[PDB]
């Protein structure tokens, strides 16, 4: 019974015996502590994880008719990770002094962390913020009602929580230094920097920016646009399933209103204005790209002498972060979450359309979704390369925001968004729309994607791959993208396999609208690296489930592809159940990347010394000079030296001895096998739980 499987996993996730949550009721990234992938420690948590918790409680609340758990989850989010604390210290002091005519001061991004700190030069005057005034008039405040992306839930970095000292969970930041700063190469620092850690008199600021003076003490937060959007997607469903408490519905509306900051160029530069390398400030909504960019960030002074604040949007947009179910919820009567601001719903209505166009634009010749686009080439408004394809005057990028690893390689970035487009096809059809350009785009995209993905899903069979991760056909040749991929397969009862990554080449054609789409014959996805990721399985299932269900609502029966998607869904759910260990549905994974715990690649500028949260001097003596080819002049320490408390982790020992016995520092290769782990990730187990739930709701009933 899929309903019983849902309830079982729900209770495994929620059980105080299992450790998915902290003593303060806050979900962790994972049960295990020793893990690094986007958070850099398993008992961090993310806005991601909160949004998934919400999704979990909505479906539970549906089945039990008790919405208390959803409300408690929202309350917990508000208390610990949204930096608005009406009835306590102000967690955004001096936000009121924000200047919407000069939202922030320009600085260039750099191609390597070695080139930071970047000068706050104001070379490009920032454009007008056109939504500040609406937000103030609507809510009586400009305090940002969005989740900060990263919380140190056990205070493992030891910074404490300055503006709320009785909370153990402290707001922390990592990424700050451009597209080559992997998770391994960032330096964790407190969002609220009173300069009591970091370099004396400077805190951590001077790693990242230079200005004429010593940096003032200051605070800053950064959301992740897909997380707040998923929170809103969850509440969409809650309301569809009967939830009707306007106290919480209104909070989702407010979150959606502030999420519009995700639609603006970093420095409010006119969209397209940097095509030839000479950007200029936006007027009205001229800096609105109507997509969800990677983040919005906001900051200001700490203390009585620092009466200023600032906001940035972002210029880089990744397909994988778009959420058109949230956009629909926020923009129509049937969606039900339209904000009360003058243009919130209408901005989201445009976004819904632009998101769908972006997916169609980015879809490869064989059906996979390519990375995205930017309004700030190289992150400094460089002129677009000759011949570069564009989308609304923004340049195509195969790896938006991050290159280490390239951000659209992971197959999870296919499942996540296509799950939502599937949902949206279903939503549109259920709402009586078979004819709009929006439904035709959503349908066309998901239909082609489903066809695409089914070539690489194996249940009870094991695909044949080579040593470099390529899938092989029955004649033993590499399968290098293309439609009608026929992967060689040996019998393997009880196993499942999914693709792990895509290797991208080429470009889409420049966008001219849906009626002119070319099918992008020059954009290729090579799908690779079979693996057993149970988070991705859960997301795929839902994609296939909602797609199947939509086809039946549309036509009266499962279509040809709809049948195949339903059957794949059912089969994946059936095999996955065997991998429940009593705590979650899990598999073992090799982590060849875990040499990066030990590699000296964490950059510090010359002349900078200070104290890390854990008490250690940084960069300290365990360093090598930075690579002169990366354009800096400083040093590298390692991830592990930076975080000496990691050596107290129970798993550290085995990792270190595995490194010592298997990794060859000379060749950069694991010679006697790579480290191996079985992780219980919060989001992954939610994606599996909700998969059983929705198959029950949409297909069984
Ligand atoms: O005139 C009044 C006073 O002015 C003071 O000077 C101010 C100045 O006015 C103001 O403009 C300036 O503002 C800059 C900040 O100092 C600086 O910290 C800020 O840097 C941004 C940076 O531009 C941006 O790239 C960065 O993005 C990070 C982000 O923080 C991080 O969370 C995110 O992580 C994502 C992961 O990549 C992803 O895997 C995961 O899912 O989600 C994460 C979240 O999305 O990654 C990105 C990079 O990709 O954020 C930082 C801020 O943290 O830039 C501001 C504008 O340039 O500050 C000055 C003070 O220093 C004077 O000092 C005073 O004399 C005057 O009175
Ligand atoms: O940033 C995307 C996403 O990454 C998740 O970890 C992935 C990682 O990207 C992938 O290469 C690895 O092999 O599998 C893991 C687990 O599915 C991470 O768990 C998320 O927090 C993050 O948003
Ligand atoms: Ca790097
Ligand atoms: Na709060
Ligand atoms: Na801990
Ligand atoms: Na407190
Ligand atoms: Na606490
Ligand atoms: Na990363
Ligand atoms: Na600064
Ligand atoms: Na994210
Ligand atoms: Na109420
Ligand atoms: Na409100
Ligand atoms: Na709409
Ligand atoms: Na398409
Ligand atoms: Na196909
Ligand atoms: Na294989
Ligand atoms: Na195109
Ligand atoms: Na992995």
Residue numbers in the entry: 2 to 702
List passages from the publication reporting this PDB structure.
Enzymes in the glycoside hydrolase family 48 are believed to be an important member of many bacterial cellulase systems which also lack the better studied GH6 and GH7 family cellobiohydrolases produced by most cellulolytic fungi. All GH48 domains have (α/α)6 barrel fold with nearly identical organization of the active site tunnel. Out of 36 residues that represent the tunnel walls and contact with the substrate/product, 27 are universally conserved and most of the rest are highly conserved. To broaden the structural database and directly correlate activity to structural features, we have characterized and expressed two GH48 domains from C. bescii and B. pumilus and solved their structures using X-ray crystallography.
The most unique feature about the structure of BpumGH48 is the eight unusually long peptide inserts that result in extra loops on the surface of the molecule when compared to other GH48 enzymes. Beyond these loops, the core structure is very similar to other well described GH48 enzymes, such as CelF GH48, CelS GH48, or T. fusca GH48. Although, computer simulations indicate that the BpumGH48 loops near the tunnel exit do not affect product inhibition. However, they could be one of the reasons for the lower thermostability of BpumGH48 by being more exposed to solvent. The melting temperatures for purified GH48 enzymes isolated from C. bescii, T. fusca, and B. pumilus, were determined to be 80, 65, and 45 °C, respectively. The B. pumilus GH48 seems to outperform the other two GH48 enzymes by a small margin all at their optimal operating temperatures. Out of these, CelF is most similar.
